[PDB]
């Protein structure tokens, strides 16, 4: 149903392709690609997370930083920060605006993420601790709308 409604609103459905041999680096790469497509390519993506997709707690910390803040400072830092800034100025001039300071570009990037990235969670049983952590987090709970389809 999430996929159906996202296809109705014209959203690019993004389901993480994870497995047992999946590293936090691959999760970071998928989040990076989704964010860069929603900002630098204006894709308007819908990210569907499931309870079996959170292998470790660091994944949940990444998601918290993605919801509470509209960006993930850990993904883009150092050299990747500079590359992202360059491509960001590229796209910003493409859209017909020049931003003066270094913070204005990142503010526009943050707004674009906030307005193009839609996250939908698909947890199964809240009685499970790994699933209870999904609701216990303040970021996910307060920034998401809760829907119940238990039985």
């Amino acid at each position: 149903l999430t996929r159906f409604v996202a296809w109705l609103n014209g959203l690019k459905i993004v389901q993480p392709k994870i497995h047992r041999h999946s590293n936090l680096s691959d999760f970071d790469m998928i989040l990076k690609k989704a964010i860069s497509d929603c900002s630098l390519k204006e894709s308007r993506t819908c990210l569907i997370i499931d309870e079996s997709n959170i292998l470790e707690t660091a994944f949940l910390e990444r998601m918290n930083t993605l919801l509470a803040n509209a960006d993930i400072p850990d993904l883009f830092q150092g050299e990747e920060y500079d590359k992202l800034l360059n491509n960001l100025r590229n796209k910003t001039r493409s859209l017909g605006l020049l931003l003066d300071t270094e913070q204005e570009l990142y503010d526009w990037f943050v707004g674009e993420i906030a307005k193009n990235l839609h996250v939908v969670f698909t947890i199964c049983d809240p009685t499970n601790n790994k699933s209870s952590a999904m609701i216990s987090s303040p970021a996910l709970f307060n920034r998401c709308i809760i829907n119940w389809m238990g039985d």
Binding site: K17, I18, H19, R20, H21, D50, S52, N53, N128
Partner: protein, 150 residues
């Protein structure tokens, strides 16, 4: 749907091997080349039996849940990032040893579970069998051949 077999002793894995002969290809979710061997076995209709069902990687999800992208003559399925073709002659079984180990809820939901375990009620059944064998052997004898000859 896919079947899941739970026998402590893996007698059943050899039974399946015997039914399928050389087409039988044995894998396990733990081994290294698994990720790739499966991608090969699915492309050429090899009956696969995954040895350790306790551990399970969701990249096989799109295969367990019947999700496929249709074309003119080929039917593909996404595994990891590679879209591999489905044969049709392909079969898939999952096998586990210990009921102690818990499989993810998604798998247990999408898969048909079967217990090939010998419990304490099997005693209650087989002692009846033996008791009727050694008490009234003639009727126990004709029991089997009744259904057989039916």
């Amino acid at each position: 749907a896919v079947p899941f077999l739970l026998d402590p002793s893996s007698h059943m894995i050899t039974v399946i091997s015997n039914y399928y002969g050389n087409k039988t290809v044995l894998l396990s979710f733990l081994e290294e080349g698994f990720v790739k061997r499966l991608e090969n076995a699915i492309r050429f209709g090899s009956v696969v039996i995954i040895q350790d069902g306790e551990f399970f990687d969701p990249i096989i999800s799109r295969l367990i849940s019947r999700e496929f992208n249709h074309a003119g003559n080929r039917v593909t399925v996404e595994i990891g990032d590679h879209e591999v073709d489905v044969s049709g002659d392909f079969k898939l079984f999952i096998h586990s040893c210990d009921p102690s180990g818990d499989i993810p809820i998604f798998l247990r939901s999408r898969v048909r579970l079967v217990h090939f375990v010998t419990n304490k009620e099997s005693i209650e059944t087989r002692i009846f069998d033996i008791t009727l064998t050694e008490e009234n052997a003639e009727m126990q004898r004709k029991r089997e051949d009744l259904i057989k000859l039916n």
